[PDB]
Every structure is written in structure tokens, then in C-alpha cells.
Design a protein around this ligand. Structure first.
Ligand code: UQ2
Ligand code: UQ2
Lengths: 54, 54, 57, 49, 53, 423, 105, 446, 146, 54
């Protein structure tokens, strides 16, 4: 019985980012989803540090 | 209820200037806050266990 | 010569703490896997064949 | 008839120190992991900077 | 009250994990020193010298 | 160059308990408590109680918990096993020499002080299903259980395995009642390999003085006769044909034992034709597809069952049963050579001597002997007993089988398997 | 036979009445905190004691919602308070401490 | 009474003699009325090439079916008539033919064994009958999921080496192996310096020696010739074979790291560590309370039907790990807990559980060497592998040396951060990906 | 099968027929457990094609005209490629089947071979059945003439 | 089969706010949890409309 599998918070992380069954198959065109997330937090982080002085 | 009333005491002292009666009774209330949670309430629970033959 | 399983025929079951359950005696199935296609369904909600506490140095 | 299953030849993909079937892999074991872990070690150092 | 974890096996288990816990402290000390550029410690380090002379 | 071996020592106590020991100078010790507590002592109100008992040996006892029995035994690398026949239960215990005392203590606790705690008994009930399921994967298990149910009115008709309807329904009281009326001094034997006789005698006198139970080898088994049929389509038909034979340690039982080896028991050669097996050759003559035949021989306290067991293809079953039964008939008619009895005597004698080669086989033989006969009979007087069987006796055993009311169990596609009246 | 043990008993009875779980028809062992030892002791209880316990707790949670209390005649008398969980709990504690002694070795 | 320590000294020494052709003859005498005798040969499927793979297995089928002196069923008629048991086995490294017999029958039993080894009359019609028998046996073995995964684990672990092959061979070998193929195998391999006459029971060593000169001496008196026949190391890989069959109701998985060979002292500590993890199946009494953390967790949470740890030894290599049988939704949990135990033993093994493993091994060793047959096997096998019999008191000395530090050292050496060979058969969708099995072979915390 | 076998009578009468006969009438009305999941589309097709044939059928109608039924029969029910008889003949064997339950109550049936339907002897059996006693006639009655 | 019970978003709402098994029993002292949520969104909403002009 795994800590990764049954902890109510890590459950969410595991079923999204670790044990999630994904096609053997998906190309570079599938990279843009995570890249949009990276873009979102980049804009959040810089935007926060700009808001500190604007 | 001693804890609630002591907390009510501490908000009264917080409202007053750092002068004669207020310095000491605020010091005693501070001590009582920490003594109630750390010492007096755990001991009350043991006594209550012993009184129910537990 | 007084022992039912040593007389070889009637049925004996063994349970243990550390070792697999056993059944039975001398009914045939040693000269029965010898003319063949006795598949015998070997491994379907089931214990271990051959037993193990017989390990080497 | 499951005894007809051979694992197919992997020489095309094998690391050079592991092509000899007549010779132990244990000898090249420390080196092969060494190379691959050095890659991740340098990357971590690179990212760390 | 914590007396569950006191006995010969837990003494052996602590002894096993000591070189590891020591090395994880050694990891973290250098990592703090590196991240902050901790001037106090890095003056000793014979080649890492951003301050002249 | 080995040491000159010790003799076995043997003691009957006034209370009826039997102690037998051998000091082989071995690194391990084996200890068994053999009890007349097998499934024949169940009745129609408590079926399966000795099955659940057989499964219950690491449940909590008085000063030894379930945890302690498991951990303490495993800490010294030991085993605790329980093996059951229709007649006996046998609680055996193995460890290294130095560790006998702790395993003895666990043994005595299991057998004389089990608590049968309500919830422990409950958590154990599903294990009857697993255990029965695993055992009944061999078709032989179904057949021989049905064979005994068909043969007997009573006692020996009972299964080694709990009836399905009883699973979940055997109680802590029924377990307590079973131990208290069967696990008693006059129904027990304490056997030990690689222990001293004074230690065993002492253990017996201190810890195994119980009575408040039954007396006999039971309510007497009434042989009935009949047939039980189980449709499967299993590709193969398993059949057993049987008649009433002889109680264990009668002279007639030895005649049955020898006839069993005239007709043919197990094989002797890996992948062999079984040349000197007279049943196998008789079936082989008129059947040209995969089969098996063995003589079947089960001897009990107050009864026996002798005949044969067949495996064959569904369409071939009738032919295999009829070829086999005709071969027995042909010995009953007197067609039996002196060399054939002698070869059968050689197989039985060698079989018996090989049977007792290991500690496990030695202890079980000494244990069952102590329960059946009240005595230990050394190998050479068993061999003498086998030798004394005349040719006429083996003819007489075959005669008894052929003329006697039959019992039959079979399973498979039974569309070509004969009933008893068709034989 | 003691005046002082009668005194401790009278402080205990006083406390019992002050605690006032008996006012809701509860027994002492109905009020115990459900940890792992306690959940197992409850699991181990026979049918009758199990079914009585649930109804008592049902009746108490019902009263506690209505913010009401049983007629005085129907309060559980301190002398009549059955310690029905305690022997199972002692055994469950006893079994755990044996495990913990083995984990030490 | 004697102690355990004393009891091991009182075990009588195995007597060894060499015959002039190089046949070793060895015996442990006890007081027994019965004996086991047999020939252990340094021959098996590891010696076979691609083209003759399954030959020894074919010989095993022919060995009992007639000689030049005892044609057809005459041999089995003699064995049966004295109440003897004639048996055989074939592994990747060893062949054995043995007789269980009365001790007074040791003269004839040795005479028969020699007749089988030297004078195998492989009649063309008999080799044709055996063709169909072996073929059916292959169909039978297909249904045993245990035998299939272990063949699969060998085929992937030893990838392109002779240790990858099955004992029985492929079906095309079974249907095309000729008599000339078989006699060539016999000529090359059944040679006196490579085989051992072993006995255990009621016998003097002197008469075992006498019968060996009587019946075996025409074997390699001038037959010591041709390339005699070096084995060569087998490259272990680190790889996966996954036979996905959802029609089967339970998954079989076997997993192993490369073990060291027969020779290595490391075997004793590995066996201690394997004993700590132990075995399990569903018929074991009291599950929750079992000492092994794997066995305990597997019982409580219904994680499997069975598991077994193993340490299969070959010359200069082996397979060290475990096998299990479980439901389709349980493979991940089983693999997790198994690997955690390996990792735990590498990093943080403790004194008390090592004692338990030591004790389990003394009890296994002694309980195994119980009967004429297992002792005879051990004499025969040991002289092929170690070149001595290693006495019981030596094993005890080797067991006693093992403590927690040794278990941590020796497990780390073979398990920690090593590439496993993995074999999967059945409903194996939930069998973890190989990268994630590789990642289970070390710990980030350590 | 589960619903039907909730009545103990169903077990008994199935076992009674299995005990009584070698053959044919020994077969159960309900599928044997081992056959559940194992009866095939082919076996169904073969069963219909060798049993559902003109010389084995009767078409009965209440509240229909005879010309309509006769017409339906002649247009749609002209099949044969099947068996002929009322079967392979039932061989009466005799014997007993015993099922341990502890059901508080024992259900038993004792039986011997009697008479084929629409023989004169069958009517004798029918009358004896009512001498000895069939079902009850009065709600909660003592069954005086039974 | 309910739309409230199986829709991947409404699932979350149903298992928190509708079908969630709660004690028969909990008094006014249990009202403060929802009240803290109301407080949180009140402060968010007013705080947003203050941020529009601050
Ligand atoms: C099944 O397909 C999926 C991928 O495969 C192409 C991904 O790569 C990612 C990774 C996405 C990231 C890191 C963005 C997270 C966004 C927020 C707002 C925290 C997800 C979630 C996913 O579901
Ligand atoms: C099981 O007990 C629960 C209650 O019973 C006392 C509630 O009343 C509420 C209601 C809470 C609300 C409306 C606040 C939501 C907060 C955010 C940040 C959206 C929840 C969730 C709860 O779990």
C-alpha cells in the first residue's frame, strides 16, 4: 500500500502526473499543453514582481 | 472558560497603556494562557480519566 | 504397518503455519501424465506446487 | 511450444561493451551506469546554476 | 511518552541511517552556503574567491 | 561409518496415553501429538468441525497469543503442521535440537489450551473455502470423498473438508466440544524424534492428563454400498470401484496390501510401460489411448475399502472399468503365479521400508501405529507379517472384492461410464 | 469497610452525575474516543452488546440534536453502569504491547 | 542430551574415491535398510547448441526403454520385480539417473545404472515413439504458468547465450533431432571425469568402489580425446519479456538480478536475506502475524495468491530474486512491496531478522537432507559443483558468520541499483513499466 | 436456477429423477452449474433443428378459427430434418440421492416405476394417488379423508 | 442514474454540499465554517471593487 497512491492530496498528483495512462504515441504537438501551464505561471510570477512596483 | 476569559483579559490589557496595575496583571494573564494549555488542561483530563476509573 | 496414507490410497490433508497445504495419496496420476495431455489447470485462484522449506546452502 | 520463444537480437541497439554474449556484463556495469548518471549529474549542475 | 521506539532494533536502525543523515546535512550545508554566497565560509574555500586580494 | 543406532522406547500410561521416542542423534527434532479426532467422529449436526479445527492451530491459546505462536515458531525457523485422516488428527512440530522446549510449549498450548475466541474463529471461516477449493482442484479429491460418502452410512462417510453449507456456520462452542471429547489421554499418542524418553514421559505426565470424552474407535462404521455420480465433461473420467475389505492390522489386511501390488499400485519407472502391473497391462491390451489404473487400498480401524481407480477418456471409461474388473476376476478365479505374489511382496516390503526412511514418514508411522495397535511393530516383523501371506490369501481377497456389494464414485462426462449393475 | 473509600466513591458518583452522559442514557463506554484500539474492541463485541451500544448512541445523538434530556427515572444509575467495552479494550491493548515488545528485539 | 552443534559432528563423513578412468565414487553410510544410488552427469541444455537443444531431454526419454543387454521392457521388469524405483531429471547444468532400492540390492542397482549410461540402445522406432510423447509434454507445460515464466526469465536474462534455452528444446528440434545427433551428444558428454556415482544408505564405501570398477571401468580408459568441453560465461542482460494474455485469470511475474555462481561464498548471506523475505501462499495459517513484512502485507491486503524468493545457481552466474502469482489489480502493489524489502535489506537490515533467516536456513538445510534420496542427490550434485561434499558443520560455520552488516553488504552488491531481468505472463496491463521497475532498484533517500 | 431452487421441492424432484433413471428423464429442467456459460449458439441451433419439427409439434389455439390455424400450420410449420421417437427410451434404474442441509425440515420422496401416460394402469395410479392423498381441499383442515 | 451524481464537476458539488452525510446533531457552533467562507468571498468581492479605485 503506497503513500503516493492513497494520501488524499498526492492521489490528485499521482492520477494526473505519474500513473496517468498516456498513449505511447503522442508527438511534439502534444508538448504545448504543459507549455501553456509554464506560460501561465511565468506570466503569474513576473506579473507579481511587476505588480510590486507598478 | 478560564482560557476564554483570560483571552478576554489579554485583549483588555492590549487596549491599555504600559503602566502600574496593567503590566503585572498582563504578565500573569500571559503566564496563565501558556499554563492553561500546556499544564492545567492536560492534568484536568487525567484527573477526569481517574474519576471515571479509566 | 498401521497408517492409512502409508497404505497409500486414502486421503490425507495437511495444514501448516509456514508451508503450503497438501492433499491425498494413491489414487493414480503419476502413470497418468506419462500418456499425455493431462494439462491440469495450474494456476487458478490457487496455492504453490512442490512445497518450500527445502532450500540449499 | 512456448519453448519456441527466443528473445530477438538486440545488437543494433546495444552499448559496445555489452555486445559479447560470451562475456560478463557485471564488468561493464559500473562504467555504463557511470556514463548515464554523469549526464544527469551535469544536467542538475547546469540547471542549478 | 514515546517509549514504543526504544530497544535494540531501533538502536540498530538509527545506527544504519546515521552516515546517510550526516551526508544529507553535508548536502544541505553546502547548498545553503552556495545559494546565499555565504561570505563567512567561502573565504576559506581556496579557489572560490569573487572578492579580490 | 555411522554410530550404532538407539532403539525406540515406548510407554503406555495407566490413563491410556502412549509415549514413543527415538534418539537419532540428528540436528533437528520432530514432535507429533496424534489424536483419534479425525472426521469420522463428526456427526450430522457438526460436519466440518475437524476441518476448521485443522485450520485453527495458530489461533490464541492460554498464555500463547496468535501473534506469539507465529513469531516464536518462525524466530527459531520452526514449523507447526496439522494433518488429518478420516481417523486421526496429528499435530506436528519441527525445529533444531536446542529449541524443543519452546515448540513443545506451543504444541501443548495448541492442543490442550485453545481459546477459540469468537472473532478469531469468524476471521478464519473464509479459509475453509480457500482450503477446500485448493484441495478439490485435484479430481481425485472429489472422487475419494464421494467414494466414502457412497460406501458408508456413517462415520467414514464424512468428508475431510467442510460441507459448503457449514462454511461460516461452525461455532466456537462446537470447536470447544470437539477438543474436549476427542483430545483426551486415552485417545492420544505423543511421539518424538530427537528427544529423550524422560523429557517426553515428563511432558506427558505433567500436561496431557485429560479425560472427559468418548471411549471407542467410534460409533462403528456401517458399510452400505452405492454409487455417486458427478457430471463435469472434464475430458477425462475419474472412476473408483470398491468393496468392503479388512480392518487395519488384521492378517486379511496384509492379503489386501499384497493383492494391491499384484494388481498394481503406483509406477516404479519414470515414463515406463508398467510391465509387471497386471491391471495396467490388462487395460492396455484393449485400449489404445491415454489412461491410468491403480489398485486402491484404504484400511481403517473397523473397516476397509479395496478395489481400483481409473482415469480414461470419456468414451473409453466403460472399457477401462470392464478390463480392470475382469483382471481382478481372473485372480479370484485362481490364475495367480507364485512369482507374481513374490514380486508384489518385494514391492510392498521395499515400499514400506522406503516409507519410513525420513523423519516425517517414520514419525507418522510410529504415531498411527500407536493409535491403531497400542504398540510399536519394528520393520522386520512387518516384513515377517508380509511374508506370511499365502497365495490363497491373495486369491481370497480378490474373491471377497468380486462377490461383495460395491461402491462407486465417478466424475467427468459420464455418458459412457457404467453404473454398478452394468458391470 | 472504609469511610475514605466511601468518600472517593462519593466524589466519583458526584463526578459521574456532573459529567451527565447518564442524562442522555449513555453508559461510560459509549462516550470513549474511537482510536484504533477502541475501534477493534467495538469490532470484537458480541451481537447483543453491539446492537445495544448503537441504540444508546442513536438515542443520545437524537437528544443532543433536540438539546433535550431523558426523564430522571431513565438516567443511567452510576451503580448500574456496565463497563462492557473495558475487558475487550484491555485485551486489544495487551495484544498491541506484545507486538511492540517484539518490534523492539 | 547432545546439542545442535554436537549433532552436526556426529553426521558421518562422505567417503570419496576416484576410479582410474576418472569416475568419482562417493557414499554417505547410514544404518538404513534401503538406499539411493545414481549417476550425476555434468551435462544439460547449457552444453547444447541451437541445433541440438533438447537432446539430453530426448536421451532422458530413451534411457529406460532398452539396452544392448536388456532390450525393450526388460530393464523396467527387473527394477519393478525387486521393488526398486528408477527415476531421472534434466536441468540446464546437470543430468541424473537414480535408483531407490533395498540395500541388499545395491549390486544389481549399480549394474543397471551402468547399463543405462554406457549401453543405451536407442532403437529408431523407440526414438519415433518418443517424438510424439515429448511434443505432448510441451503442450502440457504450456499450461503451467510457473514453468513458462521461468523459461521466459531464462530466455530474457541470458539472451543469446546457451543459458537462454529450455531443457526440452523448441518443437522443431523435437521433430528433427536424429539418432546420430543423439549418439554424438552421448559420445561427447557421457565421459567418466564428468560423472559421479553417488550413494546414500546401508552400504560400505568399499563395495560401492568394487561395483564401480566392476561395471563402469570401460568408459574413459582410452576415450580421453576431442575438445573436452569448456562452458564459457553467459552474459546476463537486464530486460523484460511480457506475454500479455488477459484470458488467463491470474498474473505470473518473475523478477531477478544476476546472481553469482555455485562457487561464491555470497550465496549463504543471499540465502539468509531470501529467508527473511520468505515465501507465501493463500493456504498458510495465520497471515497478519507472519514475520516477513512482504508475507504479512500480502496476506492482510490480499496482494497475491503466492510468492517465492529464489537463488538459482549456475556456473559463474545465476538468477536471484522472486516470483509471484496475483490478481490483475495487484501487480503494482506486489512489485512495490517486494522491491521495498530488497531496498530495506540493502540499507537498513537489523540483527534480529537476520537471526530468523539464519535459523530458517539451518532448519531448511537439515530438513532437506532427510532420506537416502536427497542426501544422494547432494553427494552427486556437490561433487559436480564444489568438487567436495561441504559437510553440515561447514554450512553452520558459514551461516553463523552472517550478521546484519553482511546482509546489508551482500544485498547491496547484487540488488542495489542493478538492472533486473523481468518476465510477465497473463493479465499484465498493471505490470509496472521497466523504467519504473529499474527505479525500484535504488532509493532516493539513501 | 437460483430462484427455482429456493423451493426445496425443486432440488428433491430433480435429484429424484437423476436417481431413478439412467437416461433421458434423469436430466434436469435446469442447466447443470458446469454448463452455465458453456452452452453455445451451435448447440441451440442443433436443438431447434432436430426437435422443433412437424412430426414433433402441435399448434393449439383458443379464440381463433380452425381455417386460420390450419393455414398458419401449412404455410409456416412444414419442417423436417430431425429425430422420430419419444426418444432414446428411458431406462429406470433405481437408487438414492442425499443432500445434507440442516434445513430444520427434511424433504424426502420415495418412488417406484409405475405406468406410461394414457395406459389404463396410469388411471389406477391416478386413483391410488387420491386414495393415499394428494393436495389439501380445506384451508387449514385436518385432511380427514387423506 | 443521476446527472447530479455522475457529471465530473457536479460530483464534487454533490459530495460536498448535497449528499454529504453529516451528523443529525451539530449545533450553531458548526455554523462558523460556512460563515468563514461567506466572509472570504465578501472580502474578495468588496476588496475587488475597492481595488478598482485604489
Ligand atoms: C493527459 O495529458 C496531459 C499531458 O500530456 C500531454 C501533460 O503534459 C500535462 C502537464 C500540464 C501542466 C504542467 C500544466 C498544469 C496547469 C496548471 C494551471 C497548474 C497534463 C496536466 C495532462 O493532463
Ligand atoms: C462537512 O462539514 C461542512 C459544513 O457543515 C458544517 C458546511 O457548512 C460547509 C459549507 C462551506 C462553505 C459554503 C465555504 C466554502 C469555502 C470556499 C473557499 C469556496 C462545508 C464545505 C463542509 O465541509
Amino acid at each position: 500500500t503506497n503513500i503516493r497512491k492513497s494520501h488524499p492530496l498526492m492521489k490528485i498528483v499521482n492520477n494526473a502526473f505519474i500513473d496517468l495512462p498516456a498513449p505511447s504515441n503522442i508527438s511534439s504537438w502534444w508538448n504545448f499543453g504543459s507549455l501553456l501551464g509554464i506560460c501561465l505561471i511565468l506570466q503569474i510570477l513576473t506579473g507579481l514582481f511587476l505588480a510590486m512596483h507598478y | 472558560w478560564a482560557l476564554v476569559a483570560d483571552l478576554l483579559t489579554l485583549t483588555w490589557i492590549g487596549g491599555q497603556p504600559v503602566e502600574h496595575p496593567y503590566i503585572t496583571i498582563g504578565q500573569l494573564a500571559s503566564v496563565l494562557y501558556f499554563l492553561l494549555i500546556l499544564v492545567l488542561m492536560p492534568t484536568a483530563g487525567t484527573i477526569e480519566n481517574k474519576l471515571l476509573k479509566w | 504397518m498401521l497408517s492409512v496414507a502409508a497404505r497409500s490410497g486414502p486421503f490425507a490433508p495437511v495444514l501448516s503455519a509456514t508451508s503450503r497445504g497438501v492433499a491425498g495419496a494413491l489414487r493414480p496420476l503419476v502413470q497418468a501424465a506419462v500418456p499425455a495431455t493431462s494439462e491440469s489447470p495450474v494456476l487458478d485462484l490457487k496455492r504453490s506446487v512442490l512445497c518450500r522449506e527445502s532450500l540449499r546452502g | 511450444s512456448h519453448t519456441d520463444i527466443k528473445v530477438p537480437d538486440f545488437s543494433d541497439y546495444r552499448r559496445p561493451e555489452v555486445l559479447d554474449s560470451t562475456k560478463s556484463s557485471k564488468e561493464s556495469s559500473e562504467a555504463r551506469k557511470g556514463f548515464s548518471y554523469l549526464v544527469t549529474a551535469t544536467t542538475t549542475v547546469g540547471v542549478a546554476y | 511518552m514515546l517509549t514504543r521506539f526504544l530497544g535494540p532494533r531501533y538502536r540498530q536502525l538509527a545506527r544504519n541511517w546515521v552516515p546517510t543523515a550526516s551526508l544529507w546535512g553535508a548536502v544541505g550545508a553546502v547548498g545553503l552556503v552556495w545559494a546565499t554566497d555565504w561570505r563567512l565560509i567561502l573565504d576559506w574555500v581556496p579557489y572560490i574567491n569573487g572578492k579580490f586580494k | 561409518v555411522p554410530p550404532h543406532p538407539q532403539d525406540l522406547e515406548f510407554t503406555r500410561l495407566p490413563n491410556g496415553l502412549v509415549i514413543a521416542s527415538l534418539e537419532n542423534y540428528a540436528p533437528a527434532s520432530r514432535i507429533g501429538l496424534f489424536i483419534k479426532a479425525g472426521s469420522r467422529y463428526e456427526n450430522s449436526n457438526n460436519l466440518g468441525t475437524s476441518h476448521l479445527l485443522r485450520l485453527a492451530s495458530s489461533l490464541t491459546t492460554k498464555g500463547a497469543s496468535s501473534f506469539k505462536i507465529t513469531r516464536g515458531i518462525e524466530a527459531v525457523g520452526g514449523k507447526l503442521s496439522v494433518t488429518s485422516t478420516r481417523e486421526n488428527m496429528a499435530y506436528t512440530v519441527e525445529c533444531l535440537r536446542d529449541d524443543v522446549d519452546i515448540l513443545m510449549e506451543f504444541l501443548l498450548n495448541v492442543t490442550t489450551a485453545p481459546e477459540f475466541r469468537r472473532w478469531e474463529v469468524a476471521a478464519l471461516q473464509p479459509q475453509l473455502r480457500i482450503d477446500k477449493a485448493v484441495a478439490l482442484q485435484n479430481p481425485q479429491a472429489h472422487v475419494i470423498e464421494n467414494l466414502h460418502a457412497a460406501a458408508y452410512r456413517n462415520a467414514l462417510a464424512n468428508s475431510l473438508y467442510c460441507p459448503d453449507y457449514r462454511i461460516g456456520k461452525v461455532t466456537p462452542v462446537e470447536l470447544h466440544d470437539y477438543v474436549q471429547n476427542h483430545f483426551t489421554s486415552a485417545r492420544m499418542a505423543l511421539i518424538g524424534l530427537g528427544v529423550s524418553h524422560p523429557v517426553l514421559k515428563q511432558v506427558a505426565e505433567q500436561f496431557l492428563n485429560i479425560r472427559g470424552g468418548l471411549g471407542l474407535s467410534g460409533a462403528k462404521a456401517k458399510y452400505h454400498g452405492g454409487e455417486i455420480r458427478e457430471q463435469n465433461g472434464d475430458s477425462l473420467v475419474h472412476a473408483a470401484l470398491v468393496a468392503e475389505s479388512a480392518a487395519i492390522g488384521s492378517a486379511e489386511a496384509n492379503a489386501f496390501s499384497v493383492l494391491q501390488h499384484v494388481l498394481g499400485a503406483g509406477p516404479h519407472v519414470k515414463r515406463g510401460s508398467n510391465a509387471t502391473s497386471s491391471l495396467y497391462q490388462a487395460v492396455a491390451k484393449g485400449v489404445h489411448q491415454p489412461f491410468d489404473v491403480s489398485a486402491f487400498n484404504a484400511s481403517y480401524s473397523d473397516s476397509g475399502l479395496f478395489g481400483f481407480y481409473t482415469i480414461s477418456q470419456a468414451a473409453s471409461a466403460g472399457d477401462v472399468i470392464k478390463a480392470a474388473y475382469n483382471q481382478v476376476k481372473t485372480i479370484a478365479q485362481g490364475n495367480l503365479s507364485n512369482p507374481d505374489v513374490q514380486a508384489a511382496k518385494n514391492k510392498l516390503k521395499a515400499g514400506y521400508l522406503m516409507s519410513v526412511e525420513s523423519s516425517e514418514g517414520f514419525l507418522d508411522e510410529v504415531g498411527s501405529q500407536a493409535l491403531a495397535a497400542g504398540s510399536y511393530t519394528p520393520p522386520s516383523t512387518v516384513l515377517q507379517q508380509i511374508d506370511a501371506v499365502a497365495d490363497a490369501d491373495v486369491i481370497n481377497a480378490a474373491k471377497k472384492f468380486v462377490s461383495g456389494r460395491k461402491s462407486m464414485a465417478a466424475s467427468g462426462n459420464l455418458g459412457h461410464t457404467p453404473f454398478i449393475d452394468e458391470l | 469497610v472504609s469511610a475514605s473509600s466511601r468518600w472517593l466513591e462519593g466524589i466519583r458518583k458526584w463526578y459521574y452525575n456532573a459529567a451527565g452522559f447518564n442524562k442522555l442514557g449513555l453508559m461510560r463506554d459509549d462516550t470513549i474516543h474511537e482510536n484504533d484500539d477502541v475501534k477493534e474492541a467495538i469490532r470484537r463485541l458480541p451481537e447483543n452488546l453491539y446492537d445495544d451500544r448503537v441504540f444508546r448512541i442513536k438515542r443520545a445523538l437524537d437528544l443532543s440534536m433536540r438539546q433535550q434530556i431523558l426523564p430522571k427515572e431513565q438516567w443511567t444509575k452510576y451503580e448500574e453502569d456496565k463497563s462492557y467495552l473495558e475487558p475487550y479494550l484491555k485485551e486489544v491493548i495487551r495484544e498491541r504491547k506484545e507486538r511492540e515488545e517484539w518490534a523492539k528485539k | 542430551t547432545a546439542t545442535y552443534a554436537q549433532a552436526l559432528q556426529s553426521v558421518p563423513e562422505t567417503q570419496v574415491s576416484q576410479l582410474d578412468n576418472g569416475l568419482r565414487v562417493a557414499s554417505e553410510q547410514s544404518s538404513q535398510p534401503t538406499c539411493t544410488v545414481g549417476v550425476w552427469i555434468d551435462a544439460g541444455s547449457r552444453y547444447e547448441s541451437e541445433k541440438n537443444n533438447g537432446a539430453g531431454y530426448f536421451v532422458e526419454h530413451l534411457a529406460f526403454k532398452g539396452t544392448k543387454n536388456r532390450p525393450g521392457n526388460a530393464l523396467e521388469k527387473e527394477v519393478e520385480s525387486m521393488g526398486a524405483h528408477l527415476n531421472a531429471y534434466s536441468t540446464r547444468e546437470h543430468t541424473a539417473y537414480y535408483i531407490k532400492a533395498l540395500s541388499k540390492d545395491l549390486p544389481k542397482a549399480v549394474e543397471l545404472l551402468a547399463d543405462i549410461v554406457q549401453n543405451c540402445s536407442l532403437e529408431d522406432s523407440q526414438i519415433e515413439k518418443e517424438r510424439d510423447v515429448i511434443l505432448q509434454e510441451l503442450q502440457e507445460n504450456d499450461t503451467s504458468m510457473r514453468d513458462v515464466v521461468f523459461n521466459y526469465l531464462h530466455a530474457t536474462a541470458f539472451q543469446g547465450t546457451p543459458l537462454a534455452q529450455s531443457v526440452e528444446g523448441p518443437s522443431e528440434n523435437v521433430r528433427k533431432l536424429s539418432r546420430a545427433d543423439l549418439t554424438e551428444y552421448l559420445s561427447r558428454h557421457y565421459k567418466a571425469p564428468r560423472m559421479v556415482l553417488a550413494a546414500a544408505g546401508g552400504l560400505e564405501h568399499r563395495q560401492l568402489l568394487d561395483l564401480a570398477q566392476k561395471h563402469f571401468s570401460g568408459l574413459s580408459g582410452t576415450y580421453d580425446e576431442d575438445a573436452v568441453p569448456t562452458l564459457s560465461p553467459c552474459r546476463f542482460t537486464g530486460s523484460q519479456i511480457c506475454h500479455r494474455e488477459d484470458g488467463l485469470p491470474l498474473a505470473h511475474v518473475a523478477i531477478a538480478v544476476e546472481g553469482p555462481g555455485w562457487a561464491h561464498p555470497d550465496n549463504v548471506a543471499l540465502q539468509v536475506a531470501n529467508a527473511i523475505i520468505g515465501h507465501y501462499d493463500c493456504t498458510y495459517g495465520g497471515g497478519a502475524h507472519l514475520s516477513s513484512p512482504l508475507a504479512s502485507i500480502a496476506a492482510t491486503n490480499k496482494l497475491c495468491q503466492s510468492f517465492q524468493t529464489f537463488n538459482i545457481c549456475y556456473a559463474d552466474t545465476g538468477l536471484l530474486g522472486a516470483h509471484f502469482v496475483c490478481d490483475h489489480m495487484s501487480i503494482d502493489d506486489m512489485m512495490f512491496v517486494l522491491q521495498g524489502q530488497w531496498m530495506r535489506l540493502c540499507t537498513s537490515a537489523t540483527e534480529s531478522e537476520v537471526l530468523r533467516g539464519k535459523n530458517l536456513l539451518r532448519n531448511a538445510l537439515v530438513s532437506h537432507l532427510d532420506g537416502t534420496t536427497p542426501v544422494c542427490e547432494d553427494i552427486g550434485r556437490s561433487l559436480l559443483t564444489y568438487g567436495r561434499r561441504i559437510p553440515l558443520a561447514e554450512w553452520e560455520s558459514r551461516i553463523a558468520e552472517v550478521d546484519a552488516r553482511v546482509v546489508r553488504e551482500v544485498c547491496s552488491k547484487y540488488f542495489y541499483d542493478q538492472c533486473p531481468a523481468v518476465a510477465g505472463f497473463g493479465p499484465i496491463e498493471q505490470l509496472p513499466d521497466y523504467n519504473r521497475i529499474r527505479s525500484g532498484m535504488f532509493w532516493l533517500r539513501f
